[PDB]
Swiss-Prot record, chains A, B:
This is (2Z,6Z)-farnesyl diphosphate synthase, chloroplastic. The keyword Transport does not apply. Specifically forms (2Z,6Z)-farnesyl diphosphate (Z,Z-FPP) from dimethylallyl diphosphate (DMAPP) and isopentenyl diphosphate (IPP). Also able to use nerylpyrophosphate (NPP) as substrate. Involved in the biosynthesis of several sesquiterpenes. Belongs to the UPP synthetase family. It is an enzyme of class 2 (transferase). The lineage of its organism: Eukaryota, Viridiplantae, Streptophyta, Embryophyta, Tracheophyta. It catalyses: 2 isopentenyl diphosphate + dimethylallyl diphosphate = (2Z,6Z)-farnesyl diphosphate + 2 diphosphate. One of its GO terms (molecular function) is magnesium ion binding. The chain holds residues 77 to 294 of 303 of the full protein.
Amino acid sequence: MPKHIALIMDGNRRWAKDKGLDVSEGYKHLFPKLKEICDISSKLGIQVITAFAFSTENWKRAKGEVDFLMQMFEELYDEFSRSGVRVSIIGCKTDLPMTLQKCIALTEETTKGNKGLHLVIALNYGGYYDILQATKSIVNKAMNGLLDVEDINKNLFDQELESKCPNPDLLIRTGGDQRVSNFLLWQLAYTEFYFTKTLFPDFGEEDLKEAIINFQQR
Amino acid sequence: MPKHIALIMDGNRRWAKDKGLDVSEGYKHLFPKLKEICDISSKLGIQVITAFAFSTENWKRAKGEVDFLMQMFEELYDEFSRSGVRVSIIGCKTDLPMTLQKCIALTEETTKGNKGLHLVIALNYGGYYDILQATKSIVNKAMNGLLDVEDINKNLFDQELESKCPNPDLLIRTGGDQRVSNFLLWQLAYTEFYFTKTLFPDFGEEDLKEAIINFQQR
């Protein structure tokens, strides 16, 4: 049974587009579906989910679409505050609207004592970003006499990266593409990959169980 | 048509073990099969192959097995010197036996002027290692006044990493496992993944063409 599942929640836009609906109709399934996935996963004993909600590259989408997502993301608090999930966000929080920053901070503060499933939401995150910010911190420490070049090792990076040990055992990507798309690059070094054509809004208990059984076959 | 294919050449050990033969019988297919793959790929117009021959983690195999591989790897020169392929090795060369180091250096020197397919052989390489060595170089530059913390960006890393732009368009992993196994972690951020149960010694033109056609369907 995986302890840590990484989740690339792709296929929300296409789900709507395929039906001739506007993209908001797909995106509105994001937190409700993720919640469902968390509930099923905690019952199966899974301890951590890291879910990719907004990539550093997604700012390239249409302005209105980006603005819709950023407003929708403020539903974070209402969606997870009383779920018993411990919520953390990783990514560059200071690029986000201040109201979203406060919603995130509040959601983190209120759930930090919860001891069930730890949900990490990667929001304005990318692998490049994570490695770059960790590198800046390492350089800062070096320039302040706190470490030498020979002290630079994997464990130091695991201390400075936002996504931390234990690393994902399994990655699930919905929506049919077979890429990691600048998700948790460092952290996925030994993770088992599972790709399904099933679009995120259509991804249910049977789909998750199938991924896990595929994973349990080694 | 992919310009750069990354190749995880897995399944040589299992190919032999499955037949009740010792592992050397599988490993002896490595450079001959890779050569074949290079010939087919250059004719298809593919410009670069980065092939994973020995991971930083493979030192954990049995001593005799590790020693066999290191000796077999010295066939590098005879296998590729007159192939018209331009050969580069990436990985920590100074951990290798000195005779292998010279074989590698010689193979690089003699093929550097070739203008067909560029074969990069990842030998005692890992993604962690590549990011760590690049980070050490960045820290060294910072401690010598050559850059500030704000200069640390993706392009700087692309300059310091051993595996360089252009990054793999497609990754093929033979042997059935669906992991990147600490290969080119940074460089695989947008690479399409293709996994086949076909063991490396059995991987032929039809298998490669099938991977590429799978890739050409986007």
